[PDB]
Amino acid sequence: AQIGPVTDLHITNANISPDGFSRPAVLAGGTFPGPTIAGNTGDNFQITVFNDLTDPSMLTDTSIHWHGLFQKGTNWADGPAFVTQCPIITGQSFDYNFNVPGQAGTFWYHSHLSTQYCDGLRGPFVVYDPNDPNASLYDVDDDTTIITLADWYHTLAQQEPIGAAITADATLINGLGRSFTNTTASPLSVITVQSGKRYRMRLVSISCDPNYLFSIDGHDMTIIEVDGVNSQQLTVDQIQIFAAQRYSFVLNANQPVGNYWIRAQPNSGGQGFDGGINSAILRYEGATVEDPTTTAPTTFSNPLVETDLHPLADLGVPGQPFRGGADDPLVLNLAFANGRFSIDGVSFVPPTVPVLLQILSGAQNAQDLLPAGSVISLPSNSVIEVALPAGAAGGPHPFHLHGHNFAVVQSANNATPNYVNPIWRDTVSIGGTGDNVTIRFTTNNPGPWFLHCHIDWHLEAGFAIVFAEDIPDTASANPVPQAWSDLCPAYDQAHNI
Ligand SMILES: *[C@@H]1O[C@H](CO)[C@@H](O[C@@H]2O[C@H](CO)[C@@H](O[C@@H]3O[C@H](CO)[C@@H](O)[C@H](O)[C@@H]3O)[C@H](O)[C@H]2NC(C)=O)[C@H](O)[C@H]1NC(C)=O
Ligand SMILES: *[C@@H]1O[C@H](CO)[C@@H](O[C@@H]2O[C@H](CO)[C@@H](O)[C@H](O)[C@H]2NC(C)=O)[C@H](O)[C@H]1NC(C)=O
Numbered sequence: 001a002q003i004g005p006v007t008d009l010h011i012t013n014a015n016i017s018p019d020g021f022s023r024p025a026v027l028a029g030g031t032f033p034g035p036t037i038a039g040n041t042g043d044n045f046q047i048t049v050f051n052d053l054t055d056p057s058m059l060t061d062t063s064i065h066w067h068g069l070f071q072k073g074t075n076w077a078d079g080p081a082f083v084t085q086c087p088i089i090t091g092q093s094f095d096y097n098f099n100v101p102g103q104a105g106t107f108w109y110h111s112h113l114s115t116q117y118c119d120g121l122r123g124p125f126v127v128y129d130p131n132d133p134n135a136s137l138y139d140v141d142d143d144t145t146i147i148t149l150a151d152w153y154h155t156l157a158q159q160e161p162i163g164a165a166i167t168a169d170a171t172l173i174n175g176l177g178r179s180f181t182n183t184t185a186s187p188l189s190v191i192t193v194q195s196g197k198r199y200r201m202r203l204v205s206i207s208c209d210p211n212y213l214f215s216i217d218g219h220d221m222t223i224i225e226v227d228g229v230n231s232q233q234l235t236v237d238q239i240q241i242f243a244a245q246r247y248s249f250v251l252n253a254n255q256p257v258g259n260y261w262i263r264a265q266p267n268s269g270g271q272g273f274d275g276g277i278n279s280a281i282l283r284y285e286g287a288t289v290e291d292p293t294t295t296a297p298t299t300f301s302n303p304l305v306e307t308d309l310h311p312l313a314d315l316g317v318p319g320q321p322f323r324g325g326a327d328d329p330l331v332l333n334l335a336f337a338n339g340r341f342s343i344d345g346v347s348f349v350p351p352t353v354p355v356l357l358q359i360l361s362g363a364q365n366a367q368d369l370l371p372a373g374s375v376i377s378l379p380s381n382s383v384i385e386v387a388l389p390a391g392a393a394g395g396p397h398p399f400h401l402h403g404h405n406f407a408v409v410q411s412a413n414n415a416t417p418n419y420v421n422p423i424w425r426d427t428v429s430i431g432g433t434g435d436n437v438t439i440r441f442t443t444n445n446p447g448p449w450f451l452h453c454h455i456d457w458h459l460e461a462g463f464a465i466v467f468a469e470d471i472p473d474t475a476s477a478n479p480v481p482q483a484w485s486d487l488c489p490a491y492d493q494a495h496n497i
C-alpha cells in the first residue's frame with residue numbers, strides 16, 4: 001500500500017539481504033526501498049517522521065528531504081541537514097508539514113544527513129494528477145508500475161575506508177538483485193503486465209552514485225515525464241538515468257506473452273548480466289514462471305539523448321537567448337583535488353547552525369553566512385543562469401537544485417544551447433570534459449536552497465553550495481513551527497555542542 005499524504009513514518013535499523021548478503025540498514029517503513037508516499041497535486045502532506053534509530057554505525061540522527069518538491073513558504077521542511085534544519089535525534093519525531101501546489105509527477109524521499117541514504121533511507125514519492133494531460137496514454141498507473149533503481153553496498157556508508165575506491169556490490173531493481181561478486185541466485189524482482197494494456201512506468205533512480213543504462217528486452221519506452229515535468233512523447237529503447245532523476249514512460253504490453261529481461265547497467269561495479277546481476281524480469285500474465293531467454297542488442301537503436309526531450313507545455317526559457325542573457329549569470333568553477341570537491345574554491349563542510357536558522361537570526365548577507373564562501377545570495381524575481389562546466393574527477397556529475405526545477409539550456413556532450421524548448425528538470429548530468437551544461441530558473445521562492453552533486457559520496461566530500469535566495473524575504477516567507485525551533489537546541493544538547 002501507498003501511504004500519505006498524512007502518515008507516520010518510522011525510521012529504524014534492521015537487517016536486510018536484498019542480494020542474499022545480510023547487513024544492517026537504515027529503513028523507512030521497515031523496507032528497502034521505503035514505502036511509496038503519495039497524494040494528489042496540491043495536497044497537504046503531513047509526514048511525521050519518528051526517528052527510532054539506535055545503531056551509531058549508520059548514525060542515530062536523521063533528516064529527510066522530499067526531492068524535487070519546491071517547499072515554497074516551507075523551507076524549514078526541506079530536509080538537508082545544516083541547510084534547513086538540525087537533524088532529528090533518536091527517540092524524537094518531527095512533522096514535515098507542507099503542500100505541493102503546482103506540481104504533479106514522480107519524486108522520491110531520502111535521508112539528507114551525511115551518506116545515510118546509501119544505508120537504506122530512500123523511497124518513492126508520487127504526486128498524482130487527477131486531470132493528468134497524459135492520462136489517455138496508458139491504462140495502469142499505481143504502486144505496481146513504480147520501478148526503482150538502486151546501488152547497494154555491503155560495506156556500511158560510514159565505514160567506507162578513507163582513500164579506497166567506493167563501488168557498489170549489487171544493483172537492486174524494486175529492492176532485489178544479485179551481487180557482482182560471490183553471486184548467488186537470490187530472487188529477482190518481477191514486474192507483471194497484461195497483454196494488450198499500457199502502463200505508466202515511473203522509473204526512479206534512488207542511486208547514491210552510478211548512472212544506469214535502463215532497457216527492457218523486446219520493448220521500447222515512450223517518455224512522458226522528466227523529473228516531474230510533463231514531456232512530449234519521446235520513444236526510446238534505452239534510458240541513461242543519473243542519480244536522483246526520474247522518468248515516466250509508457251510501456252505497451254505488445255510483445256508475445258512471455259518473460260523479458262529488464263536491464264539496469266551501472267557505470268561502475270559489475271559489467272554485464274552474468275548470473276542475473278543488473279537484472280529484473282518483465283512477466284506477462286499467463287507466461288511460464290521461468291527466467292527470460294531474451295538478449296539485448298549489441299547497439300541500441302534509439303537511446304535517450306537529453307536534447308530530444310521537450311516540455312509538453314509551452315515552458316520556454318527565461319531570459320535572453322544567449323550566454324549570460326540573465327539578470328544573475330553565474331559560472332561555477334567545479335573542481336576536485338586530494339579527496340575533496342570544491343565550488344569556486346570552497347569545499348562544503350556543513351555548518352553548526354543551519355543556514356536557514358542563521359538567516360532567521362538576522363544574518364542578512366551571504367558574506368555573513370556560514371560556511372564562509374559556501375553561501376551565495378540570489379536576488380528575488382530575477383532570471384538566474386548557472387553554467388556548470390565539467391572536468392572534475394568522478395564524473396559524470398548529476399547536479400541538483402533544491403526548491404526549483406530549471407530549463408536545461410545546454411546538455412551533456414553537445415555544445416549547442418537551446419533557448420527555445422529545452423526540457424525542464426531538477427537533476428542534470430553536467431557531462432564530460434569541455435562540456436558546459438547550463439541551467440536557468442527564476443527566483444520566486446525565498447529561502448536557502450542546496451545546489452549539489454547527487455553522487456552522495458561527492459556531496460559528503462564537499463561538492464555543494466547553498467543559494468540563499470531572497471535573504472530579505474526569507475523570514476516573512478517561511479514562518480516556522482515551534483517543533484522546528486526546538487530541533488537545534490535538542491540536537492546540540494544531545495551532541496554536547
Ligand atoms: C544538440 O543540441 C541542439 C540544441 O538542443 C539540437 O538542436 C536542435 O535540433 C533540433 C532537431 O533537429 C532542431 O529542431 C528541428 O527544427 C526544425 C526546423 O529547422 C524542425 O523542422 C524539426 O521538426 C525540428 O523541430 C532545433 O532547431 C535545434 N536547435 C538548435 C538551437 O540548434 C541538436 O539536435 C543536438 N544534437 C544532437 C546530435 O542531438
Ligand atoms: C560556459 O559558458 C559560460 C557563459 O555562460 C562561459 O563564461 C564566460 O567565460 C569567459 C572566460 O572563460 C568570461 O570572459 C565571460 O565573462 C563568461 N561569460 C559569458 C561569455 O557570458 C564559460 O567560459 C563557458 N565555459 C566553458 C568551459 O565552455
Ligand SMILES: [Cu+2]
Pocket residue numbers: 065066067068400401402403
Ligand atoms: Cu532535492
Ligand SMILES: [Cu+2]
Pocket residue numbers: 065067110244400454
Ligand atoms: Cu536529492
Ligand SMILES: [Cu+2]
Pocket residue numbers: 394395396397398453454455458459463
Ligand atoms: Cu559528483
Ligand SMILES: [Cu+2]
Pocket residue numbers: 065080112400402450452
Ligand atoms: Cu539534495
Ligand SMILES: [F-]
Pocket residue numbers: 066067068069401402403404426
Ligand atoms: F529537491
